[PDB]
């Protein structure tokens, strides 16, 4: 059944990761004529992109995963930068719930970059499960705190990016940007986080506590999770049985 | 050659970490009654070995033999006839600050060396400090050790839990607990006492110079990326502070500096 030759391709829509993802037609099969994306590695939630078909062969697995119209129309939205804080405030509650999942799920996404926000021809968000996201006694007086709360692999890492990512949807620019990688990297763990005079009331209470050094006191890293953000007053006009619902109307629809 | 009966029974060390550990005399062989500590891992249950034996410093137990047997492992360490540091610290109820900072330093350097290898202790508590005859600082208990960006957090960025900054918290914290007769932060119970060094609001004691609070201060910060010794100087950073002005490094290397405890 299934197997490589089921499909013809269109375009290649990024090397995104190891291995290409490519835009495809299926030609024989039920589905013969459906659009798919497929990805190549050379070897069920309302914001989880589907997974479709999977398969092995001459050493790379496969995968035939939904294809998303507004696919990249969040990495263009943030070109015109005609993101308004409401707007973003969708986007965001989204990717929490998103997040929430994958969180229960025991699932860290360390990603979360807006190249890796995609969208469904409703204007709703989908993520993946990337290649680079990751799972998940004698005395303790005397260790270091990062020790005793499994640092850079615990799931406040998603909300350290939920903030950086909100940042970057309000400004222009990610928190801690520089000249070059070296001084990025630095400006980011040395941090000081400037916050914009307009940024609202709302937004930079949010922003500062996502933005946290401090992961055990990171909003959204205790055991809440995700309920501990949305209840942030920055979400109190999101009502989540709608979100989830997909009944809200995102702002943006792919035309 | 070396083998199991090449060693009489003297005396259980302790049960601690896996395995157990003998004080052993050998009784074959060429240095024949010559007293050593024997750590015995039953095979079933980077590496304690692998690590003792690259290491080569005065401020770290010497290994001098190590073989396997019936699903055993012998490391045959050299004997320790000093103690713990901190037994020394029982009786004396707390350090002044010279003669924690001599002890201090010795273990600076050996933290110093172990780190330029790749090493890391992730523990070092204040019983992992063993002192030989000499009365000098000597790192005893292993085990098997450790070792686009716009978005991520800063814990994926530096190995947050993982680098050379985990063991710098450690020295701070025995130095807190060599002026001050206790640990930095503790609570009656363990989930009290993680929270308190995770919320970590450090108390430091009125007494101390201000060398030693800028050190503890800057030792025990609770962001690893600017703790001191975090850089690429490492013990460095850590040695060249103020609060060890007093120390000639190539003396205390040579054991040529002395004890304020002669055991």
């Given at each position: ?23 495809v ?24 992109v ?5 398969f ?13 119209s ?23 509650a ?11 799920k ?16 409703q ?16 005395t ?15 799931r406040?890492?998603?909300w ?24 990025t ?19 930079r ?51």
């Amino acid at each position: 059944k299934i197997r490589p030759e089921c499909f013809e391709l269109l375009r290649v829509l990024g090397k995104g990761g190891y291995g290409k993802v490519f835009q495809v037609r299926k030609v024989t099969g039920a589905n013969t004529g459906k659009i798919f994306a497929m990805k190549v590695l050379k070897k069920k939630h309302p914001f989880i992109v589907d997974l479709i078909y999977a398969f092995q062969t001459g050493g790379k697995l496969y995968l035939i995963l939904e294809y998303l119209s507004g696919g990249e129309l969040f990495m263009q939205l943030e070109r015109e930068g005609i993101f308004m804080e409401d707007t973003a405030c969708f986007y965001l509650a989204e990717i929490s719930m998103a997040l929430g999942h994958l969180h229960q799920k025991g699932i860290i996404y360390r990603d979360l970059k807006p190249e890796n926000i995609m969208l469904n021809h409703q204007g709703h968000v989908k993520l993946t499960d990337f290649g680079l996201c990751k799972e998940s006694c004698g005395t303790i007086e005397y260790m270091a705190p990062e020790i005793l709360m499994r640092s850079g692999h615990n799931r406040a890492v998603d909300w350290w990016s939920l903030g950086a990512l909100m940042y970057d949807m309000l400004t222009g620019a990610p928190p801690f940007t520089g000249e070059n990688r070296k001084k990025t990297i630095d400006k980011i763990l040395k941090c000081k986080l400037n916050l914009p005079p307009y940024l609202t009331q709302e937004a930079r209470d949010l922003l500062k506590k996502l933005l946290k050094r401090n992961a055990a006191s990171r909003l959204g890293a205790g055991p809440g999770d995700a309920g501990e953000v949305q209840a942030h007053p920055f979400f109190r006009h999101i009502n989540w049985e709608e979100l989830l619902a997909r009944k809200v109307e995102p702002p943006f629809k792919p035309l």
